[PDB]
Design a protein around this ligand. Structure first.
Ligand SMILES: COc1ccc(S(=O)(=O)N(C[C@H]2CCC(=O)N2)C[C@@H](O)[C@H](Cc2ccccc2)NC(=O)O[C@@H]2C[C@@H]3CCO[C@@H]3C2)cc1
Ligand SMILES: [Cl-]
Ligand SMILES: [Cl-]
Ligand SMILES: [Cl-]
Ligand SMILES: [Cl-]
Ligand SMILES: [Cl-]
Ligand SMILES: [Cl-]
Ligand SMILES: [Cl-]
Ligand SMILES: [Cl-]
Ligand code: NA
Lengths: 99, 99
């Protein structure tokens, strides 16, 4: 699809067997999801943005379905105010910015 | 152009006669730039990012060149770790997200 940016670029994702809404976010290096459990091992990480840093759990090799496209990669889980699909997974579905 | 996301989508902007680098950020509603001087009056605004809320200065109707395209609109100035071009100006330059 092609998505204009008049509104937030929100899509449905499936992660951990759960359906969620998430922002397609070219300004995010990493994918960050609101608190939930994921299978497997994880390691702690700090990520920063406007407002400062938050502590997250880093899970590797997690599959997400992004608007019907499967991707695999690292997912950060923590007290983010929004679910964010970052560039590490956007590349996997071939997303580009065009102007 | 068409910009893939394997690297940060950084472009050159020109604002107040100064060249700067900024991130094209579909996850940002607003354009937020690092502290600098701008003409005119400003108004208060609070924005919420990943680490919490910050106060910024809202300057309206500021002329800003983005990757060679002219935009005129609202610019927020505050302690951001990076200059970010948000949807308010991405729509002016006609950007879309495609996959
Ligand atoms: C390490 O991987 C990550 C690191 C930081 C972030 S982030 O959420 O902090 N952010 C990073 C951006 C902003 C600073 C920078 O250099 N890149 C991604 C952003 O798209 C973020 C994503 C975001 C974070 C929190 C809430 C909503 C979206 N949006 C954002 O800060 O927008 C600001 C806050 C205001 C809310 C929406 O628009 C307004 C302007 C995401 C992944
Ligand atoms: Cl859960
Ligand atoms: Cl970070
Ligand atoms: Cl935290
Ligand atoms: Cl990854
Ligand atoms: Cl590619
Ligand atoms: Cl450029
Ligand atoms: Cl700069
Ligand atoms: Cl502040
Ligand atoms: Na894992």
């Amino acid at each position: 699809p092609q998505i204009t940016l008049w509104k937030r670029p929100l899509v449905t994702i499936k992660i951990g067997g759960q359906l969620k809404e998430a922002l397609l976010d070219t300004g995010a290096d990493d994918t960050v999801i609101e608190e939930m459990s994921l299978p497997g091992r994880w390691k702690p990480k700090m990520i920063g943005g406007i407002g400062g840093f938050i502590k997250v759990r880093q899970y590797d090799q997690i599959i997400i379905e992004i608007a019907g496209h499967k991707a695999i990669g690292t997912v950060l889980v923590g007290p983010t105010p929004a679910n964010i699909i970052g560039r590490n997974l956007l590349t996997q579905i071939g997303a580009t910015l065009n102007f």
